[PDB]
Design a protein around this ligand. Sequence first.
Ligand code: CLA
Ligand code: CLA
Ligand code: CLA
Ligand code: CLA
Ligand code: CLA
Ligand SMILES: CC1=C(/C=C/C(C)=C/C=C/C(C)=C/C=C/C=C(C)/C=C/C=C(C)/C=C/C2=C(C)CCCC2(C)C)C(C)(C)CCC1
Ligand SMILES: CC1=C(/C=C/C(C)=C/C=C/C(C)=C/C=C/C=C(C)/C=C/C=C(C)/C=C/C2=C(C)CCCC2(C)C)C(C)(C)CCC1
Ligand SMILES: CC1=C(/C=C/C(C)=C/C=C/C(C)=C/C=C/C=C(C)/C=C/C=C(C)/C=C/C2=C(C)CCCC2(C)C)C(C)(C)CCC1
Ligand SMILES: CCCCCCCCCCCCO[C@@H]1O[C@H](CO)[C@@H](O[C@H]2O[C@H](CO)[C@@H](O)[C@H](O)[C@H]2O)[C@H](O)[C@H]1O
Ligand SMILES: CCCCCCCS[C@@H]1O[C@H](CO)[C@@H](O)[C@H](O)[C@H]1O
Ligand SMILES: [Ca+2]
Ligand SMILES: [Cl-]
Ligand SMILES: [Cl-]
Ligand SMILES: [Fe+2]
Lengths: 456, 342, 37, 79, 336, 137
Amino acid sequence: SNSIFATNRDQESSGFAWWAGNARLINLSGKLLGAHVAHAGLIVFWAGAMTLFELAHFIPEKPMYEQGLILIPHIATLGWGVGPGGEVVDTFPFFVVGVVHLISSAVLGFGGVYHAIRGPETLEEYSSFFGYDWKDKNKMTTILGFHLIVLGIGALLLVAKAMFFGGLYDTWAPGGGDVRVITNPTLDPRVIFGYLLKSPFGGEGWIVSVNNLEDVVGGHIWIGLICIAGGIWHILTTPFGWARRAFIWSGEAYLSYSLGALSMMGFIATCFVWFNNTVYPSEFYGPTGPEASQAQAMTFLIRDQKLGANVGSAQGPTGLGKYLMRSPTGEIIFGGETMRFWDFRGPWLEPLRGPNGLDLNKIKNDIQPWQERRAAEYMTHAPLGSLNSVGGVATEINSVNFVSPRSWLATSHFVLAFFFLVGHLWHAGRARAAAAGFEKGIDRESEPVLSMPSLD
Amino acid sequence: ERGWFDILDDWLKRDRFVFVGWSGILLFPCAYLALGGWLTGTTFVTSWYTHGLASSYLEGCNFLTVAVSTPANSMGHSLLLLWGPEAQGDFTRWCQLGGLWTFIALHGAFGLIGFMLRQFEIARLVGVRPYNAIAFSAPIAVFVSVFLIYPLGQSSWFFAPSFGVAAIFRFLLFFQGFHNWTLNPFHMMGVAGVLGGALLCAIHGATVENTLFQDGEGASTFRAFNPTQAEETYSMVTANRFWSQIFGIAFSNKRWLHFFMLFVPVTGLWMSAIGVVGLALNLRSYDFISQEIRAAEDPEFETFYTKNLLLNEGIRAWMAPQDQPHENFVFPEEVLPRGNAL
Amino acid sequence: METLKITVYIVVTFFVLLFVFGFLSGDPARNPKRKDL
Amino acid sequence: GERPFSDIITSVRYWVIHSITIPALFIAGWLFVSTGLAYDVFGTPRPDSYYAQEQRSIPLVTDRFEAKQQVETFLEQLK
Amino acid sequence: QTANLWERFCDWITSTENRLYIGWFGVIMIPTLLAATICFVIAFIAAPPVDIDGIREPVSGSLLYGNNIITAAVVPSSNAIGLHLYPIWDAASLDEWLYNGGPYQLIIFHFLIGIFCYMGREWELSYRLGMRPWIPVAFSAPVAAATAVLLIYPIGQGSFSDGLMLGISGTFNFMIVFQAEHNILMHPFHMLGVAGVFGGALFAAMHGSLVTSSLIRETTETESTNYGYKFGQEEETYNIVAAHGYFGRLIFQYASFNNSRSLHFFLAAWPVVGIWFAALGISTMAFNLNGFNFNHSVVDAQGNVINTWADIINRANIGIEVMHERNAHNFPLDLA
Amino acid sequence: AELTPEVLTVPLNSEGKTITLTEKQYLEGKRLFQYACASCHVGGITKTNPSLDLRTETLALATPPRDNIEGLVDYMKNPTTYDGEQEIAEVHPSLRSADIFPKMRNLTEKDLVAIAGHILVEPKILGDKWGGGKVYY
Ligand code: CLA
Ligand code: CLA
Ligand code: CLA
Ligand code: CLA
Ligand code: CLA
Ligand SMILES: CC1=C(/C=C/C(C)=C/C=C/C(C)=C/C=C/C=C(C)/C=C/C=C(C)/C=C/C2=C(C)CCCC2(C)C)C(C)(C)CCC1
Ligand SMILES: CC1=C(/C=C/C(C)=C/C=C/C(C)=C/C=C/C=C(C)/C=C/C=C(C)/C=C/C2=C(C)CCCC2(C)C)C(C)(C)CCC1
Ligand SMILES: CC1=C(/C=C/C(C)=C/C=C/C(C)=C/C=C/C=C(C)/C=C/C=C(C)/C=C/C2=C(C)CCCC2(C)C)C(C)(C)CCC1
Ligand SMILES: CCCCCCCCCCCCO[C@@H]1O[C@H](CO)[C@@H](O[C@H]2O[C@H](CO)[C@@H](O)[C@H](O)[C@H]2O)[C@H](O)[C@H]1O
Ligand SMILES: CCCCCCCS[C@@H]1O[C@H](CO)[C@@H](O)[C@H](O)[C@H]1O
Ligand SMILES: [Ca+2]
Ligand SMILES: [Cl-]
Ligand SMILES: [Cl-]
Ligand SMILES: [Fe+2]
């Protein structure tokens, strides 16, 4: 009664110290449900509260990327609130997204707190549907299937937005970036799955190279159907013998598999926001590193050519062209250190590119002021800056309060992906050792090495 | 009738929360003044008159940029005593002249002596061998060579390290640009001892923790240990087999293992101290003569060694006017070495 | 160069297949304790 | 042989004493700065006292034994 | 039978009786580490100069081409290649491949695969031996650091020509340029790294000295005290209560470990976490989120900058910046 | 040293008329300069064209003269090349091109005067460091 150890919420009952206390939940399906739903509330809370904070701080006439925004860029990329060139025409859609997430987080938090402290601690006595045993392989694949179906619907919501509810922001739209309705999504599997077999190295870039919204939307049509089909599959089947023999079947093992999965996705997202300027439009996120470096070469090409330079024939100090040179396969590219960035592609630059690379005739005659503007802007918003948000190279003096959203998003998600790989190793190794029965140490009376022949 | 010395010895060595000892008579005042001097200086004291630098919270610096900075080069190696001929008893002028630097360096030195003496004294009273004291000789060699011998070989205390986070980073880059200190094999042995010591720390802790015997039922395994137990808490035999098969060799002797954990970082720090003693005299490992002969004759010959000297030349030319203000360097823009565009 | 490329592709494929089929071959049961895994 | 810190800092007597002494020390340190006394004890320039209005040169000490009088001269050139 | 012959192979691969454990991770580790080592040794001795910065300015890295052990390196692939994969079979000739820094890519990619498999192999053998599984978690710290400087940093900057150069002086070149371009000394993750390795060395010496200090007398005055411990003996070889009694008096009682399991967890955790943060420092400065910038942070009443030590660091950084790769920049900002 | 009325007194026009800025004016000018200009003109240089800086002596030799409030205010409405021959509002932020440089959209006459006063006062404080670049950091 009046005893501190009288509950099962201590090391004495559970075998786990307070600093591993959430492991006490492994076999308490009800409270563990509470923990998960409450945690979902925290995610949704942040999405809502952070959007309202961003909107309250938002000056619509400054670029988003001058304002430390990462969520409003996500909403704008879906075509909400913006017009030609990414200009903000209406902030109310940002407000709605923020409010509805914040209100929804209250419902999730309510259910989480209920299940965590007031509801039934285990679900199995209460419901055969919601109860589960981690070692019940069929129940596990059924719950996986439910969530696969939910994820497929989610992918089809993006498609629905792109095709029937206003479209998406298209940085590549002919005549300038603009919101565009996608009517011909790419369904050809040779294109969609071709992305998955591209090398991740330079000039290829695996799926990070996706460069048009038709492929994006068609890809999500495929992922939607694949996930719904796989979900139906896993509700109607149980694991084959070869799978049963290959895997560890425990809650901690399943957690470890998902940690390895999320780590991989985190590293992928890091590269996506660093290199891709289609689903991360530079109008909202700022230029990529490659983009800003190319924009500097473009800027001084324009300036020096205006002064009378023949930029095609100008030999730089090394013997390579000061402004223009060849890639290792012959394409005409910008010179200087930005020779490394010749795989870059962006809508302000492509009008100057022909079958042989950069076209000297177009460079001499057809560079428009909006291209000079965009190159100057992007050169001066390169994703370089200090931890206290002093923009520029590390030797820059204080003045410009700037760190690119691309740098914030790349660094955070590398840090997170890395620790999640560590978590995968931790929990995968522990799940193996626990399934085999030696996660608490070596049995003194049955030490395996003592029964092995010496090595020499 | 015992005798006042023995009665004092009794009281000094009483088993209390903070052991005092004879060594504490030296240790506690000198450690307290060194620490108190650093906190006082970094909170309130400028470096305007010695360095042309702000250096305190009072002036607007933060924890990374505050320092107690060295005296001006014109002070030479003056002890800079409060009552000495420079400050002449004026506490305010003493602070403005940099007296807190020698205050901290000298009380710090005698405090470190007091601490090593404490290690000896406690070991003798408890009855253990004084290896902890012996290992501490490495921190002492580093402090003495870096904060005392190095400036004593140079023109003045000005070129000792200043006591601050960013000030120390400046000291690192100064040693790169002027001494090419990374090229010095005594620094390299120091690096090996520090990184090798950290490696030994990690691998030994990890090995013990993953060869534990199951001595309890808890999934958290810390509770299954008793300090008075006779038995090893982990399997040396299983650990030895694991590393033998993974890496090719393994410890088999626990005593050697733990001596080696002392030997590696202690020896490394001792070697780095020797190199700094050379740098006190500008006896640098600055160049490889054969490389310079070849590069001077052959303008197509380039190595990472010649590339780093160009960086050093940049460090010296661009940092010296503000870093050595007593020299009154004026380097017109046209003489500054620099590559294309930058 | 083309012969080298094919050779390396085969070599890489060979070792990767050994790794995948190896770890598929009932690896949980290859431990000194509970082998009914 | 002395009382554990956890007994001391969870006692009413400890907090009666230190509810006075800790704020008092905090306020005295505050005033040490806000009255400007910290500047004059340690000889730290106020924001308007690093340079005279016309010159933009550092008052660096160059004389070991008359450094005290040299600082005193650099300070008289401010006002 | 195929299934029997394959099971015999699996039993040999995973055998706890091989002098060096092979295992399934070892099936990948052994060929990749051999390829990387052989290429590295040959290149370090004999490779001709390499145009690291893509400006037709080849840097000599090998011993036979005028280097010693301290200056030699295997030089990164050309800036003209950037992040493109440059295998031997994409070159017109070995001569071209060598000029452009082909060996570097072969070495680093085989090495990285090899050390990741080395880490998995540490998990694997621990599983075969009935050990607990987290030694590879400790090794993940150096693996993460190697991956940061050989893979993540060049990806972020768009070129393997900016990855760690494989030699002693090449390492220093990488470090000095990095300081100018990221102010890594002013980055808190590098500071945590330093605490990790300074603290790891300190705690190694501390732990080593305390155990050595309290060895139980088991030898005569002639022989090494090391003979007082016999491999595999059941009893502890030092008096941990004596060791704790010393260290608790050296500082104070509750600052000292009496639990050997807690003590050894701390010894593992401190350097490992420190190096995790070091690796994350490089891996996030790879995307140009750089060290603290307090350049001109202190300003007087009129508006004059009052320099701090941060500003003196900045002057050294500028000197490095303007001099490095002195023929490679044509435009005013070094943006990668 | 202090930010005095004398330091804050700058040429209003080429004819020799002066204006004494308030401390609030100067601070507003500094803030607005950071908001709209420092991405290219930090420290008095010009990142996208380093040949032209914001030094008073450079502004004095521009056509029309830009070393005074009215000259700088006019420049922020209708910028020209250094010789005055060509209008460059299409590639330089100005009130005339506030449609394509949206950070100019809400700037009042008072705001332009403040920005102009910051540009003229700053070299009076910093000397050759204004427009000096990294050599003077
Ligand atoms: C995402 C964060 C998170 C979540 C969702 C949980 C959830 C849970 N934890 Mg874990 N825990 C966490 C982080 C988390 N924890 C961390 C960081 C640590 C290390 C300190 C631990 C250490 C730990 C231990 C040692 C134990 C748990 C236990 C539990 C479970 C029972 C809690 C209980 O009985 O408290 C009772 C507490 C109260 C009744 C106080 C009030 C608690 C409520 C929930 C606060 C709600 C606040 C919110 C603003 C209300 C909004 C209302 C509105 C929506 C209407 C529960 C499912 C226990 C368990 O496993 O039980 C079987 C257990 O023994 N946790
Ligand atoms: C994906 C995560 C993420 C990213 C990329 C960003 C990015 C940004 N934020 Mg947001 N934010 C986040 C999550 C994130 N935030 C969360 C969780 C909160 C709730 C606290 C907020 C609340 C918030 C506010 C209130 C504000 C921002 C602002 C910003 C901008 C300025 C950032 C800054 O100065 O940081 C400074 C950097 C630090 C403080 C460094 C933190 C270092 C951590 C502690 C390292 C942790 C390592 C790892 C996680 C732990 C490992 C431990 C190990 C033992 C396992 C930048 C765009 C600012 C803005 O400009 O808005 C318009 C702003 O005012 N954010
Ligand atoms: C995945 C999350 C999840 C899961 C698996 C459960 C599961 C359960 N809940 Mg809990 N709960 C949750 C979230 C969840 N809940 C949330 C968010 C709240 C706050 C509203 C609650 C508040 C709550 C209370 C107050 C009670 C339960 C109870 C129960 C048990 C009986 C439920 C039942 O029979 O419904 C039958 C099914 C229906 C009535 C139809 C549900 C249709 C829903 C409302 C709409 C679905 C639309 C769509 C899928 C939602 C997407 C949301 C997404 C955008 C985030 C069962 C174990 C009961 C219990 O434990 O009794 C002992 C109980 O009294 N839940
Ligand atoms: C959340 C997603 C998810 C999860 C966790 C599972 C989990 C499972 N699936 Mg299901 N599946 C899913 C989605 C999912 N599935 C979807 C959406 C579909 C429809 C396409 C299916 C269709 C499906 C079938 C037909 C089968 C499974 C089966 C299984 C079981 C064993 C699978 C296995 O061995 O994987 C590990 C994968 C391998 C062993 C194959 C080799 C893997 C290579 C070497 C890895 C290469 C990865 C590469 C580097 C990363 C991307 C690059 C690439 C694009 C080039 C396991 C319970 C099996 C089962 O028994 O079900 C009853 C089974 O037969 N699934
Ligand atoms: C462990 C105690 C201790 C030690 C070793 C030191 C050491 C030092 N102090 Mg610190 N100090 C201390 C405690 C200590 N201090 C305390 C408690 C305070 C606060 C009051 C200070 C406040 C302080 C200040 C303000 C300063 C110092 C300074 C110094 C340095 C110069 C000291 C000096 O020249 O003394 C000289 C005096 C002696 C050596 C006394 C020796 C007495 C002899 C042995 C008597 C011999 C008698 C003989 C046998 C009789 C013969 C008779 C005949 C007729 C036969 C030196 C590093 C100075 C400094 O750091 O400058 C940078 C400085 O300015 N100290
Ligand atoms: C279990 C547990 C836990 C956790 C918990 C959690 C995590 C919870 C969550 C919770 C939640 C998640 C909650 C939420 C809530 C929310 C709300 C309550 C909201 C509201 C809103 C509002 C009210 C709004 C308003 C508005 C509008 C409408 C408009 C705009 C403006 C404003 C904003 C004003 C812990 C850790 C403690 C531990 C112990 C156990
Ligand atoms: C949306 C989109 C798209 C599409 C996409 C897709 C269609 C995707 C798919 C994807 C996929 C389809 C994926 C998959 C993956 C897989 C995986 C990831 C696997 C893994 C595996 C594992 C992990 C295994 C392991 C193992 C081994 C190896 C040995 C034995 C044992 C075990 C089993 C453990 C695109 C790009 C067009 C564009 C953009 C948008
Ligand atoms: C010099 C001198 C002297 C002495 C003085 C003294 C002895 C002083 C002391 C002083 C002191 C003794 C002071 C103190 C201070 C303190 C402070 C200022 C603190 C702060 C802290 C904090 C801020 C914290 C932080 C943190 C950490 C660190 C970690 C965890 C987290 C946290 C955040 C909590 C005499 C008179 C003899 C003579 C003349 C000269
Ligand atoms: C994303 C790409 C997806 C591509 C499609 C992937 C399909 C994967 C099919 C997996 C087939 C598994 O095939 C599996 O191989 C080996 C072959 O000995 C068997 O492994 C067997 O090895 C030995 C006997 O030799 C036994 O000790 C072990 O218990 C047993 O499992 C599995 O029992 C068999 O089922
Ligand atoms: C109409 C009378 C002529 C004198 C008054 C009008 C021009 S005044 C003139 O304004 C210019 C910017 O517009 C500046 O270049 C110049 O310095 C300023 O004096
Ligand atoms: Ca209990
Ligand atoms: Cl270089
Ligand atoms: Cl360039
Ligand atoms: Fe040990």
